[model samples]
Target: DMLHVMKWHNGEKDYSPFSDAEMTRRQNDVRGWMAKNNVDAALFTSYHCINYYSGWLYCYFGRKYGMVIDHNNATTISAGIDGGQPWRRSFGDNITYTDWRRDNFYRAVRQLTTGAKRIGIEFDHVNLDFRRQLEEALPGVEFVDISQPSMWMRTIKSLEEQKLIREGARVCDVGGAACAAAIKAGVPEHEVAIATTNAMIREIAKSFPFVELMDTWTWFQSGINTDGAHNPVTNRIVQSGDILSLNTFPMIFGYYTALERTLFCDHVDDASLDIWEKNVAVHRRGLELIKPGARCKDIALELNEMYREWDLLKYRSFGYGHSFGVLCHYYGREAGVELREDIDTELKPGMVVSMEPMVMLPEGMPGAGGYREHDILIVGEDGAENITGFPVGPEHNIIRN
Candidate 1:
């Protein structure tokens, strides 16, 4: 069913198509910004930006994709033959193709631009080779960086985007529960991840037949490997006293949310349980400080102080949280708005972020692991709402066969 769900959920019949109205809104916003900046056209090159403009979500394998939006809101796309076929089917009438063996890419891009002189491109994402080729192709056109501005537009979620993100959060919670149930003394870490991912995918298929679900990933690390934090899952067998950490991020219609929890395999010592509780306490405290108009750095400082009070500062990582949507760690603020001590960006309504304050041993500490409690939050007018509701209850924290 995992394969079935992902294969059939790509804007087909009975599955929800990416909203045309939302696409129009995005296009209009970009076009208006381009007009204001005196840019004749803006070429979206990154996978995320292309997904934002067009409804296509497939990966680009050095096969260039450009969605050029003129100041008049005219849109055109260029892709390699294989991708162009699908792009035409999805976007219709406005796409051009290249065979990948010739200079057709630049020629198609030239045609897509329609002789525009001033252009905006994603400078951060485009490679140097592509940039040089593009410069040579459009010799007289002036290119300017529009990556930051374009991404800034994607920070705040629209109602439709918010709905999809909530659905993703829901699936993440379900995945975490499945992972907790599958963890045992003899189970391999990779099998545990597979079980959780398959369970969540099956549940999503059964529950939401009309929604498009995209790629989902689960990170499962156990025993001493838990100290590695983001280490990839292996065939390592879990032991009874091992600490297991699971972090799942599932995307529903290209929007994603994160849910993380640390569990004991079966039996855990009192010291480990105390550490877990402390981590959860800091996470909850950070949640309390989340609301519209709150400074992100303030939340980080408060959490940092709480961890310091508990003498867990040595376990702290970079920051408390980060906004997520089209990309897992999408930035909401240009600088430190991600609950970092150095950032002072204010939180706003419609911004969704991950709140995680982990208490763990630093990397490479043998036999010493970590504990983390994570939640997805949507900032509201007065406060914030926790969307990923897994293991918040005391009983859910300790996993046993």
Candidate 2:
């Protein structure tokens, strides 16, 4: 009877590459979009954009490289020695490498757009100097800004993407548990981070037979450090009544799952507990409010109301949520669907969004602390599914004395 009540879906793990069928579908989406807009070919330069189409993670070192797809779905990648060598492993026989010392960047563009004049480029990422060179190489080529369309296509997750996200979320639960166990009165913050990372790495390494594709990270902070949104870890010892905070951004293949939590080391005062309880309630409510037809802005407005009611409006960190996939945080096309007061995209199926509402208490308060509960939720045809399995309630937070 007890086993029947347990949720096995939370334990699912299927780590695999993006399927050929889904890859074909994505190519078709780009090709069809190009046809509709009268664009001949599109160049994907950003790492996420390139990974979105090429199925290979480009080693990002401020390099300008990506995949160029024609209207007919013919794909080609531009890479240096570092990324080119592995191109055949994921995508076979369609790569063109360019060493700045040997050939000009314009030659790479000219090679891709041989007879095409209406070329599409991600202007946001391509440097102006490169664009000028492209203009010089191809006399009358019109470079259309297709970054928005390219990113919008990624906002919707394929079945494979969703599965990877689920796997990442599952591993995040393991990290959260490790972080909780590592929290104590005298342990250093970085050591706690090490414990969390070790647990997650062990879980992923054993669960998946492969290794080269998976990437994971955990951010840890405590005491006064947790007050700031983004603080680096040090060798400071966590004291008896300190607040332990942890955030995980784990990725399987290229998809990402964001998970954040706040835990108590020893004793948590009534003020902190009361404030955190309300924050958790509001966060849970935001999950419930997520549906196919829900407006991204409406959720933000409702959550803002909750913050005002609790006198925590000034402590609000950011908008309610943003689309989460492929990248650690959201950007470009992902921003199109962000749950901010300014965004207008409505929720849709196959979309994964993060619901993170944070509050940092003022100094000199009885239990001055910071609290945030983040979960990556998948929007289905009718409702939302919470992939993150970590506990968020105040009772679930306190470590034993």
Candidate 3:
């Protein structure tokens, strides 16, 4: 009855990739945000949010875990199943709840959140079940939505993270080179993807502080496979004149960086090349507009006119760009930083964003495939710093090999 929640702090060895100084600075910023909004505490439940603030990436198959940030302490509330792993990989005190009792999770979290008159929470991530638990955890307390403001803090960490992402950008280009070389006619799409993935993994080890890897891949699509931006690698044999999509993702400790380019295996029909060139032109236009003082919606409006003039506006697929940290195919998206029509967030200095413009025509059309040119930019006080170094357009990317 007494074993509700326990502090699991000791380990054979201490660890965590980030420095305490760094995490403390982040904690201080969280507290400042809390104060500004009259929120006495914040409960971060999403995997991405916990990893962003505490640097401890935890896995929750069925068990739940989170971080509670109050004015005085930043603590991780893990499950008893996690043992000291959370403690080993985290920044502050850790309290792991036991399944021995049903509501012990809420009981443990209430330790710090008890006195908070108003607490901040992730509205999208917190379900009714979890919300009920939160209400029980801090009865009569007001719940504030901190998802956007929380991501804004996560978004601002880019400059400190720019070093790792810059390395990833270069590594993605390294994979791109291998991908182009492996795309000769008759090679299966999977072989090209393997060639690029392996090359990038080796380069990642050569550069990053950690040797382990995850989610490093290349989506080398051909024929009908090129119709979607995220189409997986297949066994279809590459053929001369087939449109190709060279998309490389090199992930290091959950941070994602990429390089995407549209290519032709050997030759391209005039119809396909025309569509490819137009997408590239719009991509360049978006790149020029990615800088401080620009609102996300305004950027899309200006670029939409470019597509309208080309008469291919309806073919546009997804936002022009997104934030670049603690994100991969399955997790983490800072929606505040993307260049889209519905968003009005302004670009600021030290923010890292992408300018990925894609166009997809129907299967029966002349150039019936997807065309996208992607590049990463670090916004600056005056302009932008592009980290992607791969070449584009018919002159350079028509891979005859």
RMSD to the hidden true structure, all candidates: 5.5, 9.4, 2.3
lDDT of each: 0.72, 0.74, 0.86
Q: Please, what are the lDDT tens digits per residue for candidate 1 over residues 1-401?
A: 11100111123222344577877888888888888888888887776776676655545665676677776554445443343333433432345554534556676677768778888998778889988999998999999988888777776778888887777788888898888888888989999999988877776776664544456778899876776556777889998888888888776655667788887877777777677777878877888888899887788877888878867887775678887766633312233247887777888988887788766675455336867778888888888888887866347666778
Summarize candidate 2's per-residue lDDT along 1-401 as a digit string, tens digits. 11111111222223336667777777788889989999898877776776677666656554456577886655445455453343443432244554544343455555667889798888777788778866777888898988788778788888878888788888899888888888889999899888988888788777776644345777788877887656767789999878778877566666677679887788887778887788898899888888998889888888889888878888877777788676754323376888888777898898999888888876788667788888888999989888888888776788884
Writing each residue's lDDT as its tens digit, candidate 3 over 1-401 gives: 46898887768435444567877888888899999889999998887888788877777777778899999999998988888878877788788889898888888778867678998989868899989878876888999998788788877654458877888899989999999998898999999999999999999877755445667888999988988888888899988888899999998766789999999988889999889888999998899999898999999999999999989998888888998788878778898887889999998888889999988898988998889989999888898899999997887998876
Q: Indicate the TM-score of model 3.
A: 0.91
Query: Any residue pairs clashing in model 2, and if so which?
Result: none
> In model 1, where do residues sit more than 4 Å from their true spots?
1-17, 73-85, 88-94, 100-102, 207-214, 328-337, 362-367
How many Å off is the CA of 395 in candidate 3?
3.2
How high is the lDDT of residue 339 in model 1? Answer: 81
Error of 1 at 363 (Å): 7.4
Better of 2 and 3 by lDDT: 3
lDDT at residue 82 of model 3 (Cα atoms): 82
- Kindly report which residue pairs in candidate 1 clash with one another: 336-343
